[PDB]
From Swiss-Prot:
UniProt domain comment: Contains two helicase domains. The N-terminal helicase domain has catalytic activity by itself, contrary to the C-terminal helicase domain that may have a regulatory role and enhance the activity of the first helicase domain.
Whole-protein coverage range: 1851 to 2162 of 2163
Cellular localization per UniProt: Nucleus
Gene: BRR2
Segments forming domain SEC63: 1-307
Name of the protein in its database record: Pre-mRNA-splicing helicase BRR2
Length: 309
């Protein structure tokens, strides 16, 4: 499907800015996201609150206690968690969840932008949430769970053999693979679609080596084993079409400062980009570069290095 276009309202940007901070957690961000005025187009029916209160007993993150649960925010916060946890929902909530998911992508990117434009490194946590919204799983979930039809049985027979990542599955011989993949050809088709476009990239970079109040430009390159036929994303749970994108981030963990960020698409077997940042406070800094995908979990890459001021 195609998600109806829209630009997050300035009113929502103001609200997000006002609510987010350098210490916001994954939970805080989910709550903030749930407050977007944009969600007021989502139905709130008589009887829904009572159903949602029950549902909340089965979900990990609590809605802000002293906040009214008679808002659509309560519904959005909880159904999104039900989505990540893959809980069964009655049809009306299923319909509502779909309406909610149609609007989340623009909103989570605004969260990422706000935190990053402020140089807050927790921008990476917003990115984790972004991935969760696309695959319908938690960041702490078994990474294989995002593969279509990978039920608990299969996951268990991946554990015994020590198969942990999508790459491991493919590194497998062919009847160790079949033992793992006990599914119908129809199901295997959707498994295939997923593995076919699941990314595997390699990250590298370069400098100029010497400085200070002025801008240093680092050069980051991303390598794929093959230019992907395309970047259409495969998601069993996200009902709309999505194009694969990545954030290139340079930061300093110790200070949890985000030097600079850049959104790119890795549509080639090899790419190169350049980020300009300011040149830090003397002494030296232990810096890291993250290449984070916005559409899959467990495919990110990073590498750290030392500037000697």
């Amino acid at each position: 499907l195609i998600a109806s276009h829209y630009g997050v309202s300035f009113f929502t940007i103001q609200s997000f800015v006002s609510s987010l901070s350098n210490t916001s957690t994954l939970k805080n961000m989910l709550y903030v996201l749930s407050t977007a005025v944009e969600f007021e187009s989502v139905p709130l029916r008589k009887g829904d609150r009572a159903l949602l209160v029950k549902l909340s007993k089965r979900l990990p993150l609590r809605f802000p206690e002293h906040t009214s649960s008679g808002s659509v925010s309560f519904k959005v916060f909880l159904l999104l968690q039900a989505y990540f946890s893959r809980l069964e929902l009655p049809v009306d909530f299923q319909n509502d969840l779909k309406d909610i998911l149609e609007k989340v992508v623009p909103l989570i990117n605004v969260v990422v932008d706000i935190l990053s434009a402020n140089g807050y490194l927790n921008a990476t946590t917003a990115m984790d949430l972004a991935q969760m919204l696309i695959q319908g799983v938690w960041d702490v979930d078994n990474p294989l769970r995002q593969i279509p039809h990978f039920n608990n049985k299969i996951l268990e027979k991946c554990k015994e053999i020590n198969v942990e990542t999508v790459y491991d599955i493919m590194a497998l011989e062919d009847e160790e693979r079949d033992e793992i993949l006990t599914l119908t050809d129809s199901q295997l088709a959707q498994v295939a679609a997923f593995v076919n476009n699941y990314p595997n990239v390699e990250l590298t970079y370069s400098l100029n080596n010497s400085d200070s109040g002025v801008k240093q430009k680092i050069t980051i390159q991303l390598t794929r084993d093959v230019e992907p036929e395309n970047l259409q994303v495969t998601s069993e749970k996200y009902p709309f079409d999505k194009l694969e994108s990545w954030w290139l981030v340079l930061g300093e963990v110790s200070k949890k400062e985000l030097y600079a960020i850049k959104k790119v698409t890795l549509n080639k077997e090899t790419q190169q980009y350049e980020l300009e940042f300011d040149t830090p406070t003397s002494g030296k800094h232990n810096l890291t570069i993250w290449c984070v995908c916005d559409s899959y979990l467990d495919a990110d890459k990073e590498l750290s290095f030392e500037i000697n001021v």
